[PDB]
Structure 1
Amino acid sequence: MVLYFIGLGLMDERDITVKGLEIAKKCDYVFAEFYTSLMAGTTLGRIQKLIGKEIRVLSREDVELNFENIVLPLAKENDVAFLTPGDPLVATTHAELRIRAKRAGVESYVIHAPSIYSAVGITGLHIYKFGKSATVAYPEGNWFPTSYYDVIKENAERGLHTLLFLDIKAEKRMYMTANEAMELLLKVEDMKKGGVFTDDTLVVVLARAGSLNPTIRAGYVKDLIREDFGDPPHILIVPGKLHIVEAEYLVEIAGAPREILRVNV
């Protein structure tokens, strides 16, 4: 009868909400995609075991090109669920699928889950101080994306923090590390030379948020750029002007150099 978009959360199958779990358990058919983000390798088997249903995993093409041919037809006479990493509508184009559902006469409901977008709170940076967000995309052949560099500049000018989602090419098992993101940014700085991202820029890295032991590190690019932050997924953040307590947390919790405790108001 209906279609449920259910988020699985940040890191593993236990990041699903009780609400999402109880609803998924009652669905006739269950689909999912694992290309918009990276979760624990054992999330599928465990979530299948958790909801007690066989789950059909869909590729980006299956969804973007054939969602209304593979999933919607079933949601016409059965309760169907579509599982996704984190929150289904954050930094994805899945919201458009609700429009496809409506046009096919299918009612849809959304069950949220922990998202990397709000998990940034664990970095100690005030979430209301984040400005426009951006994605550091892998260059492709002669194509070298750079717009994310301009986002940092725009936010920095306003004293706002910049959240940088990192690229992912699931079919190729490619998950961009904060290290790779920093290298690309230094390359763009070389071209544009705007003094936006350099070896002296303070950055914050959050790896495997949602796990009980995520890696939270803050420091200068020259120091962080070759540091091991553990397995992906990773996000990179370029803070703007820091409040005293933000710097204090970065130093006490994220191991930032005590030098940042001193803020130039």
Structure 2
Amino acid sequence: MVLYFIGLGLYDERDITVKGLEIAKKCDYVFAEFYTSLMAGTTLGRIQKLIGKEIRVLSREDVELNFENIVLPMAKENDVAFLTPGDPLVATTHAELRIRAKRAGVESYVIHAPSIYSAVGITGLHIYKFGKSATVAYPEGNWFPTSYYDVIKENAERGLHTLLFLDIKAEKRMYMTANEAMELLLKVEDMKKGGVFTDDTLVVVLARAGSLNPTIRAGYVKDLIREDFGDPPHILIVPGKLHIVEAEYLVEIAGAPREILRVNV
């Protein structure tokens, strides 16, 4: 009679919460989407095996245009689950789907899971110091998105860190690397010349958070722009003003140049 939004976590099927698993195991029908993010350490089959159910995967169009025609009708006679990578409501437009559920007279519940938004903590950067977040989107035809550059500028101006979600074209199986994001940013800098992102800018890369051995690297763009950070997904972070201990962690844990230990308070 109800609908469950259940997050599956960062990397593999075991990143789901115990609460999410027990409820999913008992749902009559299970739907899911895998276009809002990439869970690099698992497969649909493994997820199905864990939950013990068949999973009908939906495309962005199925969801955005037909959620109330495909999923909601099932929640009327049965308990339905809608699975998503990471946390279902983080950096997705899935929250609006709860409004659709309400309008169809369907109660909905949300089961959270680890999200890349909080996983940034593993970078050593104080999470309360992050400012506005942004997404580095692939240019399309003659359209070249640049707003994410202004976000960095605004945050850096305030000494705040900037989290940069990276683009994804699931149907093309394309996942933007931190390298590609850095190249795009350098191109925007050349254009706006704001001194926001250059070869000397310190950045942090977090790849495959959720895995036991994620890649966590910190350093100057000039040195990292061509470094191999491993398979996607990746996120790029442009730190603002660093606290001594943040710098220490970046150096000791993320292999940053010891020279960043010296902060210009």
The bucket for the TM-score relative to the shorter chain is over 0.9
Q: What is the CA–CA distance in structure 1 between the aligned matches of 2:104 and 2:143, rounded to whole Å?
A: 37
Tell me the alpha carbon deviations over residues 164-187 of structure 1, each in whole angstroms, 9 at most, x when there is no partner.
Answer: 000000001110000000000000
Q: What is the CA–CA distance in structure 1 between the aligned matches of 2:34 and 2:79, rounded to whole Å?
A: 21
Q: What is the CA–CA distance in structure 2 between the aligned matches of 1:110 and 1:44, rounded to whole Å?
A: 21
Q: What is the CA–CA distance in structure 2 between the aligned matches of 1:44 and 1:21, rounded to whole Å?
A: 15
Q: CA deviation at 1:248?
A: 0.0
Q: What is the CA–CA distance in structure 1 between the aligned matches of 2:126 and 2:25, rounded to whole Å?
A: 37
Q: What is the CA–CA distance in structure 1 between the aligned matches of 2:40 and 2:129, rounded to whole Å?
A: 30
Tell me the alpha carbon deviations over residues 74-121 of structure 1, each in whole angstroms, 9 at most, x when there is no partner.
Answer: 001100000000000000000000000000000000000000000000
Q: What is the CA–CA distance in structure 2 between the aligned matches of 1:163 and 1:42, rounded to whole Å?
A: 25
User: What percent identity do the matched residue pairs reach?
Assistant: 99
Tell me the alpha carbon deviations over residues 126-180 of structure 1, each in whole angstroms, 9 at most, x when there is no partner.
Answer: 0000000000000000000000000000000000000000000000111000000
Conserved? CA contact 2:133–2:163, under 8 Å: yes
Q: What is the CA–CA distance in structure 2 between the aligned matches of 1:90 and 1:126, rounded to whole Å?
A: 19
Query: Where do 5+ consecutive residues of structure 1 fail to align?
Result: none
Q: CA deviation at 1:47?
A: 1.1
SS at match of 1:73: helix
What corresponds to 1:88 in structure 2? 88
What corresponds to 2:177 in structure 1? 177
Tell me the alpha carbon deviations over residues 25-82 of structure 1, each in whole angstroms, 9 at most, x when there is no partner.
Answer: 0000000000000013633111100111000000000000000000000001100000
What is the aligned residue count?
265
Q: What is the CA–CA distance in structure 1 between the aligned matches of 2:107 and 2:203, rounded to whole Å?
A: 43
Runs of 4+ displaced beyond 6 Å? none
What corresponds to 2:120 in structure 1? 120
SS at match of 2:72: coil
- TM-score, length-normalised on structure 1? 0.99
SS at match of 2:230: coil
SS at match of 2:210: coil
Query: Where do 5+ consecutive residues of structure 2 fail to align?
Result: none
Q: CA deviation at 1:2?
A: 0.2
Q: What is the CA–CA distance in structure 1 between the aligned matches of 2:43 and 2:133, rounded to whole Å?
A: 28
Q: CA deviation at 1:261?
A: 0.3
Q: What is the CA–CA distance in structure 2 between the aligned matches of 1:210 and 1:41, rounded to whole Å?
A: 9
SS at match of 1:260: helix
Conserved? CA contact 2:40–2:208, under 8 Å: no
SS at match of 1:142: coil
Q: CA deviation at 1:201?
A: 0.1
Tell me the alpha carbon deviations over residues 183-202 of structure 1, each in whole angstroms, 9 at most, x when there is no partner.
Answer: 00000000000000000000
What corresponds to 1:249 in structure 2? 249
Q: CA deviation at 1:21?
A: 0.0
Tell me the alpha carbon deviations over residues 206-249 of structure 1, each in whole angstroms, 9 at most, x when there is no partner.
Answer: 00000000000000000000000000000000000000000000
